[PDB]
Design a protein around this ligand. Structure first.
Ligand SMILES: O=C(Nc1cccc2nonc12)c1ccc(C(F)(F)F)cc1
Ligand SMILES: O=C(Nc1cccc2nonc12)c1ccc(C(F)(F)F)cc1
Ligand SMILES: [Ca+2]
Ligand SMILES: [Ca+2]
Ligand SMILES: [Ca+2]
Ligand SMILES: [Ca+2]
Ligand SMILES: [Ca+2]
Ligand SMILES: [Ca+2]
Ligand SMILES: [Ca+2]
Ligand SMILES: [Ca+2]
Ligand SMILES: [Ca+2]
Ligand SMILES: [Ca+2]
Ligand SMILES: [Ca+2]
Ligand SMILES: [Ca+2]
Ligand SMILES: [Ca+2]
Ligand SMILES: [Ca+2]
Ligand SMILES: [Ca+2]
Ligand SMILES: [K+]
Lengths: 359, 138, 138, 359, 359, 359, 138, 138
């Protein structure tokens, strides 16, 4: 009784902290995208604008790590209430220790304020001529910031009604259904598989094309892959497994992203073509009407084919009585074609009769 | 007569249709064979089919009769069955006869059909039967 | 007490489990709900599971009863149910009392088990029951 | 009663206007293809022939927009009759306003008479050397004219018997089937999926290969992708997802069309191989005969395998009685092979027995 | 009765002529392969060896056209016996006229003796530099000679027992099965789909790789695609839809063959992976044993998991009685892990119970 | 009785020799990888280190061939016990002779100590410029040493409980299940298909990428494909069938490995996407709960849609009584949208009712 | 009246719905047609739906009856059917009359509903029936 | 005798085949185990197969009998079962005795078969039985 009030109060606290972790997680990503794009041409890494925006990212990282710590503290309190424990140490299992530190490590990677540079040497594409540049270290930290998109999966899980409803929990309990993040994803692939596979593809299309562009701008002076629409074409053709054309990443960051694009592009392509294949198939009710209408059409076609069989049969006989040779043979040839066409419509009608009886 | 290999193969097919080896294809054996083929034939339909080739009318199928059935069915398309099925699908009432009004109806999917009917009723009973249908077919 | 929103949610769940609206979950309603979930529960096990939360023993589930069941069930893993299932696994004979012989048998998959049995026999009846098992578990 | 006469009269008016919108829609496309091809070498954009043919396109656009307006006016009258309304304003919903304007916008894009030019700068393929040309603006308007092919989907929908038959409407009503453009497409994929996927593929093969050629002729002086058979090979290999080879679009128009080719080429390829897979499968009746014949073959093979088991067994025993060693061992080795071959034919026969019992 | 003797006599005449048409059809192909390969380096097109081998091809074409005419004459006699006709003219339908002429046209294309040459101009790959050569016209006629491989489909059809057995014809008649070339192919894809898809792939692998090599030797002075192992790699990677690499055909013959390779390589790849997927699936009998064994394993695992639940429960209680804190908490943490692991093995066991009940 | 003791004693001898053949088989491979990598830069083929490590490989080849001979000798004794024979010659069938020699031939290929060299001439990629080098013959023998990985399949087969349990053998006997290497692989693809297809892919990813690197280092002075991360990218993109980019093998060894990568990459890709598709599908119990919850949601949505139907109906009537025109028409338009939305929720609810009844 | 082509099409549809050709659609024929569509209609609901268009109450559908049904049905959306289904969704008790408290209950998913009820009670019987609902809808 | 490990494995297999633990595999237990494997064995064939290894003929399988069955069964191929199945294939009449004419018929898929029959008839009863077949096979 009192556990229900505490559990539902911690559910709303965890849900509220997940939203705030998403607000600051995506704010840091948005500012990182702006800062990376602007610091290329608009200003430099040593400008006061670079320090100001990178301090905004760092401040949002401190807040995000604060909300991750507090959210995992609510998971400890929820664990103690769920399992009846009263000591927080009991909840601190090796699996939980690893994942709390893993989320902190993922969310603590950001472009630390201050200009630090490292020597980037990459082998150019289609020419194999090495090119070296003094790229900033903040590109090694801007790209991993996209790992914060896992907070979207947490917000969706904590906001789904199947995870926070009393009726869903009771009904699922009677069938012993494990309600977790996998179940919500599986149900999302049955309600709206097309929308899930389209908001996923056309969102990481820009995320990956920007990651390739932001990585292949230090090693691209010809505006080939550093172009946004060039990288959007590269990521799309690699997604569809068509190829690379002349657009091959000159860095192992672009090659790596074109590898994750090809991996998720071998699965998402198969799942999309398996969804558009389930939407072009007649339902159980629609197929019954279609086979009902084709039975009427085949019934009429059998009448007209058998009528042709008899019509050409009488033409053969009448011309035979008229002692004709060329005309009688022409209608005899037509009689065999009428009989063959009558057999064809009879066989394809019985193919329908076996089809209606199968279901 | 057929060669030894053909006769041997035809007797092999007869053994397929004759499980008990008595030399005659009874109704029960045909029913079991057709049920082994996934079909669900009724007793009346199977009896109608089994006398479709029964020359002697004894109700069972012997080897020469099976040879006749094969000689009809070994070809890619047999015209006899097609003519019979056309006659059957012409029979809306199922009585085995087609009236002049029925012919007029099946022609809409007047003098020519009248001349055809007058030339088709060889026995002059005022209607067209199956033998008249096959005579007009050939 | 629970808030108005939580009370409304649990009441809508109860009305989902109770079609006739009489305020008590009849075993027939639970059976038809379970059959609506594809499961096929027998009357014996259905009655056994409906009395698992039965405090007053009336044979029906009132709103506080279903509320207690939910308080036990909304959690991801139910420790009490797992303890009960482990107990049901232990008693091979199914009599509801686990004896030392089958305990020693299940320890192989001597002094320690003897001490466990001695410390578990709170009532001194010579055997271990479900209440002793849940007392030892907690 | 009177509604049926009005509905069936507006059905024939809508169907007649759909045909005329297709005649002028495809006439403009045909003239656009001729004008684009001829104005490259035969004449120039300032020639009187260019003005005459582009005035034919513009005139056919005025007629097409007139028939689109009148057809949508018949849809208003049909809506008023269907829903019992007597005022046209009731029918004017936001969804209908958007689609009426969308069709007008789609059908109003055409090569407006008069020579206007814009600077086209594209990065060449496999060399990354920029190439600039003064391409005419009528190529930005000729390509979108292929969006008028949606009128084919309207003509097919309004001409299908399932959409205009009294028997189909009554039967579908009893099963509550929604008769729309999706249902007709789903039924077309069951009657003749191969023909639908072949008239679709081998029609946009030329439409896309001409679009790539017409776009990559301003930026192609080496006759690589501007060639029609070069662009037909490019679109086919991109459709099949093989790659680009040396044929990579030098413009974002060719890259875009090679992207839509790769998208519809990842779906149409999967649907075609799923159709040719349903035509190589034995039907319910054909599989019964095949398993009936394999049962006879396996029955005979068991007799010959068991005969080999007994024949080699007696060879072993007879040679043993003859006190032979090499011959007895050779037939003993043959006996184990006869037994193993007899076990193999027995197992594969029971694999057939379980197969016939499964269905 | 007499029709059966005539039909079975014409069956053996048609079968004998199909074999002889295959002997001379494949003899011409073998000699064409030898003549094409040898006339490149061993001699020239004007040598007496070229005339002698091309006269062997032409002579085998005359014999092949003779056996095609006679075989189609046996089909006329078979048609007259089957349909009861006594005049050959009745059989001469438009479909039969087209196919008799089509087979003659297919089988009459060969390297006519005598040296004739035509100017071949092709755009090289990856450099777009035109290259022109005086290729012989006998390469335009050697490649179409591979269309004679359709005679293999005729020999297989006429030799299959399902097409020439009295038992198969009678059993198929009772189920109204149409015995044709499609039925034999469908049954071949059920008996040995792997062998059919391997004798087909690893035979046109050499046929297509030789066709690409024989076409891309006039326009290949760098030994890139004219190499046999280069063309075998090209045809294989295009079959698998990987790409072209540096191996792109410099002629439209190689591009065309790499297009038919990519077409049949999008279907054969899908059918092979759908066959190796049906051979890694447990049969109905094998799955029953596997689920029977997993039920025994899960039954034992439930005993050991519940034993761990009770063992750690007593460790918690005994350490609690001993007034321990660190040890009691460690075993309390182990108790929750034992309970969670006991729930996991219980859920995956019931996943098996629902699996055995489903079938 | 006595046969059971002998069979189970030879089972443990065969299992022990399979493990030792794997220890020395993989030791030779590990030393071969070290020797090949080190002899490139660390020393030369004529150094004493090359002779010492190649003598370690040769010594491990002698031991491996000894354990292969002894293991096949235990298979002879097991054969004699199983089939009741007492002479070893009976077991020596042609199939067994070929496979004993085949395993010896496979396991006897190794880098024989002593420096022997051969002239390697390969046509470079994307430039077609021949490059020749004096590569050692030990690269022709190091690569085939990876064929010793078949001993892993033997160790897994002999260690599986389904192959060595008395309960599994008895239960499988009642259903006549053939227990062999294929059955264990089929069961591994049902228990953990993802783990089998991941330990297989991410193990031959390094095996093939090292094979390509070790082969394309004699003919790669630009560090393109000889790079390990370059060859890992090449093998991955060829596995996914994306293409080659600029990374095309300059040798037929790399082309061959990129061909086996593309072959197993056309199957493993299809099997992985068919496994991740079976893990995103709701189980029988989970689908029952999901359709139970969607029925409750649709029931509530029908109440709110019908309430909107009645609410807007009264707004139409009340405004009509108020003699309003613009407001009455706006609510009449809303009434048709409410009715259409009520029909949509009714149809999608009955789509659910047919779905629950289908199963 | 309708044109000859429309009359022929509707007569073909009627003959599809009328196997014996007596001019009336017997409820057994409608039931067997519905079963041919995969549906499983009970006699009660089949009789209820067959009298929905029954002007004369004879229990059968004659040609003008089916023609009126088609005139109501050929449209993409049937407003009358949707209004009837909304009314059936409203009346949880299933008595065919929707009461004031029931309207209050369905409005939660006071003066306005009171005015609606007052203006809907044309006959002044103290409740809202189907005819009042269709009058308010139109 | 077998080792302790092997005895334990065979005993757990026997307990798998023997639910009640009485030490004898009742034919009902074998039938329910086979039904758990998806097979549908009739009582006649189940009894026939349960007496194949029944040395003392009590109608049940004790541990030594199941151990002998396992010793005959753990091998990849069972020669005795294959010989028995070949014998069952030979006798189409199903009487358990293969006559000389039957052997002559099965050899076509004269002196040699005569010598085989003469050397196989150890008891001189004029026919070949199962024991003669297994003696000739070995
Ligand atoms: O160019 C092609 N397709 C398409 C291009 C663009 C948009 C499309 N939307 O749908 N298909 C489309 C195509 C290529 C090869 C074949 C072959 F099978 F003949 F090889 C057929 C078609
Ligand atoms: O060249 C090939 N195939 C084909 C080429 C041309 C027309 C065809 N029509 O059908 N297959 C065809 C092939 C490639 C790789 C393999 C591999 F599996 F061994 F890798 C097998 C075959
Ligand atoms: Ca007879
Ligand atoms: Ca009649
Ligand atoms: Ca007559
Ligand atoms: Ca109740
Ligand atoms: Ca109670
Ligand atoms: Ca007990
Ligand atoms: Ca006790
Ligand atoms: Ca009637
Ligand atoms: Ca009436
Ligand atoms: Ca009411
Ligand atoms: Ca009223
Ligand atoms: Ca027993
Ligand atoms: Ca016994
Ligand atoms: Ca006998
Ligand atoms: Ca005897
Ligand atoms: K590709």
């Amino acid at each position: 009784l009192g556990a229900l009030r505490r559990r539902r109060a911690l559910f709303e606290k965890r849900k509220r902290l997940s939203d705030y972790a998403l607000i600051f997680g995506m704010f840091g990503i948005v500012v990182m995208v702006i800062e990376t794009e602007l610091s290329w041409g608009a200003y430099d890494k040593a400008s006061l604008y670079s320090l100001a925006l990178k301090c905004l990212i760092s401040l949002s990282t401190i807040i995000l790590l604060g909300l991750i710590i507090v959210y995992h503290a609510r998971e400890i309190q929820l664990f103690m209430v769920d399992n009846g424990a009263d000591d927080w140490r009991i909840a601190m299992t090796y699996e939980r220790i690893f994942f709390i530190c893993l989320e902190i490590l993922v969310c603590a990677i950001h472009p630390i304020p201050g200009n630090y540079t490292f020597t980037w040497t990459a082998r150019l594409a289609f020419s194999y001529a090495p090119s070296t540049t003094t790229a900033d270290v903040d590109i090694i930290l801007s790209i991993p910031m996209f790992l914060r998109l896992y907070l979207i999966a947490r917000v969706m899980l904590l906001h789904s009604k199947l995870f926070t409803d009393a009726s869903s929990r009771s009904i699922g309990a009677l069938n012993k259904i494990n309600f977790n993040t996998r179940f919500v994803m599986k149900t999302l692939m049955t309600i709206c598989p097309g929308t899930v596979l389209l908001v996923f593809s056309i969102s990481l299309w820009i995320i990956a094309a920007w990651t390739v562009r932001a990585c292949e701008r230090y090693h691209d002076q010809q505006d080939v892959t550093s172009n946004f629409l060039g990288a959007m074409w590269l990521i799309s053709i690699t997604f569809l497994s068509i190829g690379y054309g002349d657009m091959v990443p000159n860095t192992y960051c672009g090659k790596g992203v074109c590898l994750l694009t090809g991996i998720m592009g071998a699965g998402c392509t198969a799942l999309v073509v398996a969804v558009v294949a389930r939407k072009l198939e007649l339902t159980k009710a629609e197929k019954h009407v279609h086979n009902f209408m084709m039975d009427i059409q085949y019934t009429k076609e059998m009448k007209e084919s058998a009528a042709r069989v008899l019509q050409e049969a009488w033409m053969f006989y009448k011309h035979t009585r008229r002692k004709e040779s060329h005309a009688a043979r022409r209608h005899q040839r037509k009689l065999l074609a009428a009989i063959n066409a009558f057999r064809q419509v009879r066989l394809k009608h019985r193919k329908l009769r076996e089809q209606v009886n199968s279901m | 007569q057929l060669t030894e290999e053909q006769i041997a193969e035809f007797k092999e097919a007869f053994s397929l249709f004759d499980k008990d080896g008595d030399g005659t294809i009874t109704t029960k054996e045909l029913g079991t064979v057709m049920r082994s083929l996934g079909q669900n034939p009724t007793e009346a339909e199977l009896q109608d089919m089994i006398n479709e080739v029964d020359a002697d009318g004894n109700g069972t199928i012997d080897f020469p009769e099976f040879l006749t059935m094969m000689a009809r069915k070994m070809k890619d398309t047999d015209s006899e069955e097609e003519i019979r099925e056309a006659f059957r699908v012409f029979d809306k009432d199922g009585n085995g006869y087609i009236s002049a009004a029925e012919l007029r109806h099946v022609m809409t999917n007047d003098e020519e059909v009248d001349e055809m009917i007058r030339e088709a009723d060889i026995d002059g009973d005022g209607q067209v039967n199956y033998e008249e249908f096959v005579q007009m077919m050939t």
